[PDB]
Amino acid sequence: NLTMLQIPQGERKYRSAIEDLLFNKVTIADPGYMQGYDECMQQG
Amino acid sequence: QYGTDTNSVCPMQALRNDTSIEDKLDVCVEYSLHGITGRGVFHNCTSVG
Ligand SMILES: *[C@@H]1O[C@H](CO)[C@@H](O[C@@H]2O[C@H](CO)[C@@H](O[C@@H]3O[C@H](CO[C@H]4O[C@H](CO)[C@@H](O)[C@H](O[C@H]5O[C@H](CO)[C@@H](O)[C@H](O)[C@@H]5O[C@H]5O[C@H](CO)[C@@H](O)[C@H](O)[C@@H]5O)[C@@H]4O)[C@@H](O)[C@H](O[C@H]4O[C@H](CO)[C@@H](O)[C@H](O)[C@@H]4O[C@@H]4O[C@H](CO)[C@@H](O)[C@H](O)[C@H]4NC(C)=O)[C@@H]3O)[C@H](O)[C@H]2NC(C)=O)[C@H](O)[C@H]1NC(C)=O
Ligand SMILES: *[C@@H]1O[C@H](CO)[C@@H](O[C@@H]2O[C@H](CO)[C@@H](O)[C@H](O)[C@H]2NC(C)=O)[C@H](O)[C@H]1NC(C)=O
Numbered sequence: 001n002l003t004m005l006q007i008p009q010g011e012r013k014y015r016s017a018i019e020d021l022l023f024n025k026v027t028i029a030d031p032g033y034m035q036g037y038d039e040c041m042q043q044g
Numbered sequence: 045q046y047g048t049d050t051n052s053v054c055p056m057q058a059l060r061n062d063t064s065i066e067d068k069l070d071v072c073v074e075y076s077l078h079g080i081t082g083r084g085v086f087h088n089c090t091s092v093g
């Protein structure tokens with residue numbers, strides 16, 4: 001059973017189930033490559 | 045002393061007319077607020093503090 005290591009088969013996914021579980025346990029800030037300047041302009 | 049009170053002491057020659065920030069949001073301005081001066085960008089927000 002290789003299900004956990006495969007990309008599940010709308011827009012196609014880019015992470016396997018185990019990759020999803022690993023990334024969900026790590027807190028990483030979003031650098032905002034596309035439009036982060038305007039998002040930061042929306043101060044809070 | 046600087047920054048130990050919510051109000052200030054000012055020489056009369058330094059006083060200027062009040063202006064509003066409503067039409068100057070999200071742009072860099074010089075400010076003077078009850079004697080506290082600086083440069084900055086202002087945005088309307090939910091009240092904290
Ligand atoms: C040849 O190569 C090129 C280059 O590789 C290929 O082109 C890429 O193809 C993919 C797939 O089609 C494109 O992906 C889509 O891009 C959409 C636009 O993304 C931008 O705008 C987003 C905001 O609108 C923004 O969030 C996004 O940036 C975040 O995500 C990217 C990764 O995708 C990160 O790198 C960024 O740092 C940033 O990350 C932050 O946010 C993430 C999301 O919360 C966090 O995970 C992350 O940690 C950060 O916090 C970017 O600037 C995007 O909208 C599309 O999203 C849909 O699909 C993905 C993948 O399945 C889902 O995860 C999304 O949820 C979303 O899902 C659903 O999509 C369908 C269809 O659109 C929609 O109907 C439905 O409503 C959506 N519903 C849901 C559940 O949300 C997607 O990511 C990519 O942009 C292309 N790159 C280009 C053109 O340069 C090309 O395909 C290759 N060709 C061949 C033949 O292979
Ligand atoms: C192979 O293993 C995966 C889990 O690693 C199994 O998938 C899970 O199955 C349970 C019970 O049906 C579901 O609640 C989970 O959501 C499934 N996880 C997924 C789909 O990632 C899978 O059924 C196994 N395959 C076989 C035939 O044994």
Ligand SMILES: *[C@@H]1O[C@H](CO)[C@@H](O)[C@H](O)[C@H]1NC(C)=O
Nearest residue numbers: 057058059060061062063064
């Ligand atoms: C400042 O306000 C006073 C009182 O309204 C007014 O008399 C004065 O002309 C104003 N000064 C300027 C430069 O507009």
Ligand SMILES: *[C@@H]1O[C@H](CO)[C@@H](O)[C@H](O)[C@H]1NC(C)=O
Nearest residue numbers: 065066067087088089090091
């Ligand atoms: C600023 O935000 C407050 C609270 O959200 C709102 O009541 C107020 O009207 C806003 N100010 C302006 C000038 O729109």
